[PDB]
């Protein structure tokens, strides 16, 4: 509808796949080469479905900070025959707050879904499904089941992936450039 939705649409059209695990269907952000991210609670195994195709997982790493606290981000390398457009130059380098973000979701259940969530706070610590979690972003939108893995963007930046909510607020794990140095 405006320039925030334009950046979000450009990310969804080239850098997302539908990932399915035993824990459900997720929006999955492709970042570069065959490397994507998904919420750690998706419980990625040796095999995953990518747009309904059986795909070998070459590597999966559940990130934790240097205090050994959950970050809720899993980095997956897919045995795929095609690379993602490299979008690492759109990743922030530091923890920050943001104005006017969009949460974008693409699953069987929620195709082509875009939500203007407004102001994003650097919330920091969250008890997420009973797990102490760091580097959480917060937005005041009543997010629901089916939206986990959703991409959070501003104009020019991919800042996080949706990992939970409390019925009134939604929570995303930060994406940082330093997660994806090769």
């Amino acid at each position: 509808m405006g320039p925030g939705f334009d950046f979000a649409q450009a990310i969804m059209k080239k850098n997302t796949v539908i990932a399915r695990t035993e824990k459900g269907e997720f929006t999955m952000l492709g970042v570069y080469d065959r490397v994507a991210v998904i919420p750690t609670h998706a419980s990625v195994g040796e095999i995953i479905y990518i747009n309904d195709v059986e795909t070998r997982v070459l590597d999966a790493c559940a990130l934790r900070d240097l205090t050994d606290t959950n970050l809720e981000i899993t980095i997956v390398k897919l045995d795929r025959n095609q690379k993602f457009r490299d979008i690492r130059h759109f990743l922030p380098r530091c923890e920050d707050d943001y104005n006017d973000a969009v949460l974008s979701v693409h699953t069987s259940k929620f195709p082509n879904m875009y939500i203007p969530v407004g102001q994003v706070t650097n919330y920091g610590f969250l008890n997420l499904g009973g797990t102490p979690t760091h580097r959480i972003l917060m937005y005041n939108f009543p997010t629901r089941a089916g939206q986990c893995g959703g991409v959070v963007t501003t104009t020019g930046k991919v800042i996080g992936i949706h990992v939970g909510g409390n019925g009134a607020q939604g929570f995303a794990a930060m994406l940082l450039h330093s997660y994806f140095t090769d």
Side-chain angles (χ1 to χ4, degrees):
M1 244 192 175
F5 291 98
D6 191 53
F7 183 78
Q9 182 175 254
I11 296 302
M12 299 307 288
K13 281 178 187 279
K14 290 291 171 162
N15 282 84
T16 60
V17 298
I18 303 173
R20 178 180 282 281
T21 69
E22 290 178 330
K23 304 284 168 96
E25 222 180 45
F26 296 84
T27 304
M28 161 176 276
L29 179 73
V31 177
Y32 77 107
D33 290 357
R34 296 166 292 160
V35 175
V37 287
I38 192 170
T40 298
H41 71 253
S43 296
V44 172
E46 304 301 296
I47 301 169
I48 192 169
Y49 273 50
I50 304 295
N51 295 337
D52 270 300
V53 178
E54 190 192 3
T55 306
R56 278 187 295 275
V57 172
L58 293 176
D59 187 60
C61 181
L63 296 186
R64 307 181 71 87
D65 70 14
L66 298 181
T67 67
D68 193 32
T69 312
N70 181 51
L71 291 170
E72 197 53 22
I73 297 275
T74 294
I75 307 174
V76 184
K77 187 152 176 179
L78 301 169
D79 198 355
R80 207 154 168 256
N81 70 356
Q82 175 182 177
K83 300 176 175 60
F84 303 116
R85 174 195 187 192
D86 191 338
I87 56 170
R88 283 181 290 181
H89 63 282
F90 297 138
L91 298 179
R93 266 126 206 240
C94 57
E95 305 189 17
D96 208 355
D97 315 275
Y98 299 91
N99 300 318
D100 197 7
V102 169
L103 172 53
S104 46
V105 168
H106 189 84
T107 66
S108 292
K109 193 186 177 172
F110 292 144
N112 301 298
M113 158 180 300
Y114 299 84
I115 307 167
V117 292
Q119 285 194 13
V120 180
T121 310
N122 181 355
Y123 195 87
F125 169 91
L126 182 71
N127 195 359
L128 171 67
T131 299
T133 303
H134 285 163
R135 284 184 181 154
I136 291 295
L137 299 168
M138 184 274 288
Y139 27 91
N140 287 292
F141 186 89
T143 59
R144 65 227 258 146
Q147 285 170 184
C148 287
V151 185
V152 191
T153 60
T154 66
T155 62
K157 286 200 245 55
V158 178
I159 67 166
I161 62 155
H162 185 78
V163 295
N166 61 27
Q169 304 164 309
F171 296 110
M174 285 178 196
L175 291 169
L176 298 178
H177 186 87
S178 52
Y179 298 165
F180 302 104
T181 62
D182 61 317

